[model samples]
Target: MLSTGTKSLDSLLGGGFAPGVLTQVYGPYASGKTTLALQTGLLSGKKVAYVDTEGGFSPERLVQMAETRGLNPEEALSRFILFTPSDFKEQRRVIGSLKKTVDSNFALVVVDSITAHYRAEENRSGLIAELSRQLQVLLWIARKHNIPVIVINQVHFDSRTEMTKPVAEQTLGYRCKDILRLDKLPKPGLRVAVLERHRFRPEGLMAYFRITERGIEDVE
Candidate 1:
């Protein structure tokens, strides 16, 4: 298992996500999803494979996280592998390839905003099937390498229900080992993370954390 760097989040996730499981983080923009994803790599002290479709992964923020955590930025950057896919098909290819490329050296796999390309190609049929297949490959890699897979998802506001919900929930269903929902608080830099579901822990446990320069931390 890997620590989330936030004690509250770690506890909520039961000492962080275990190997061979997908921990899904769904939230609105700037709710610290990306921050937590990057921290999984930085704090774990191991190499990570990051699939960035929404361009949410920031090298500067990673550098700051590493420096603050007393990790060498150069070494951390070297251990990080990034993949940027411009289209849904390309995204599919990138995720598919990880099964072959990732090995035991990796500590984590991250799909930052897994639904960006799916949303871009929203009108098409059979997308959910394709997305489901992509997730299967990620699950394979997680099992093969014995590492945690973190998939970040984007949410949409429903005017009829007057609620914000995650996109592609059906595609992510039953496949992920755990699921979390992050929401922005009215207070600046503060966010609420809800454990929507998990394998062992009780669901709907909420934690308040902040996105600061060091990284995601307990509200001070």
Candidate 2:
């Protein structure tokens, strides 16, 4: 298992995110979804491939947090390959190219807000197909290289079901090794992550963490 950098979060998974696994985090905005992804990239202990679909990857914030962890700002940032996909097609292109670009050197791959392109497009179904197709390719690469693939996803209220579900159909849920539901709490800076679905852990297992400037921490 690959460490999450946050001790509490690592424990949340009964250890940490497993290698060769696809992990999904879906939730409302500003619930530290991106923050968690960024921190995971920083603590990956190997090179990183980060795809920013929302164009929200913050170099300044990442540098600040990395340095706080005693990682050299310049050297550490150099190890990350950042890709910004403008649309669904572009996103597919970026993810598809990973077959060659992602090798054993890469320890982490993150698609922050993977549903942004689809949610912005006119065709959700086609985009969903594209996402699933490329996600499978990415998963294959992860399995081959024993890398951890972390995908940040979207959640919306289902008017029919009267519940929330991840965007882009339910395909990722089937293929992924784990699905974590992150939601904002009534109290500020506090968040809960439930292992809504996993390969080994039982469903509904919850872990609470706090968002701090340094990064995620055990809840205060």
Candidate 3:
């Protein structure tokens, strides 16, 4: 397994994500999910293929973050292969190509915001089934290549319900091996990362971190 280089988060994860398994991070918009994903990609030091569905990835931002962290920005940029799929069919095709590339030489795969593409492709009646199929394909690829797969997901809020409602829907929560939930703290300007669900461990393991001009840092 490859450590994310975030000591606290890695500790909660039992020394980072296991190879050949899918790890998911999910939260509302601007919750630092992308920052964490990018951090993992850079720290893995492996060939990373980022499938961007919402055109959210910014290489320039990555370069700046890496440089701020005293890492080799250029080298980090070189190892990442970025792809943006505008349509569902294109997303599927891109994943196929990614599988081939992983078969040859790749160690990490990230589908940043997998749900966005599914939303683009399918309707409500078939969304869950279609997403499940897509995840199965990703799971197969991960197992075949024996690499770590990180998928970022977006969360939805139901205003009709009370604040005591569950973090997210059971369906979305159950599809992943591990689920990391990000939320903003009540304090002036703090953010919290909660390891809300883990297939192999107990829940309620909380960690706090902040996104800086450099990258993610411990709240302390």
TM-scores for all predictions: 0.91, 0.89, 0.85
Backbone atom clashes (below 3 Å) for every candidate: 0, 0, 0
Model 3, span 1-220: residue lDDT tens: 6676677777777777667777777677678788777888888777888898867677887898889878889999888898888565577778777767775467688887655443444534566665676677788888898887888877654112476233444454455677777887766436777777786656779777777776677777
What root-mean-square deviation over C-alphas does model 2 reach?
A: 2.4
Kindly list the per-residue Cα lDDT of model 1 for residues 134-208, writing each as its tens digit: 889999899888899998876562112334344335445668879888999999899999998789989889889
| Pick by lDDT: 1 or 2, better one | 1
- Report lDDT per candidate: 0.82, 0.76, 0.73
Against the hidden true structure, what lDDT does model 1 obtain?
0.82
Q: Which runs of model 3 end up more than 4 angstroms from their true locations?
A: 116-123, 157-173, 186-189
Better of 2 and 3 by TM-score: 2
RMSD (CA, Å), each prediction: 2.6, 2.4, 3.2
* Better candidate number, 1 or 3, judged by lDDT: 1
Ranking by TM-score: 1, 2, 3
Report the number of the highest-TM-score candidate. 1
Model 2: colliding residue pairs:
none
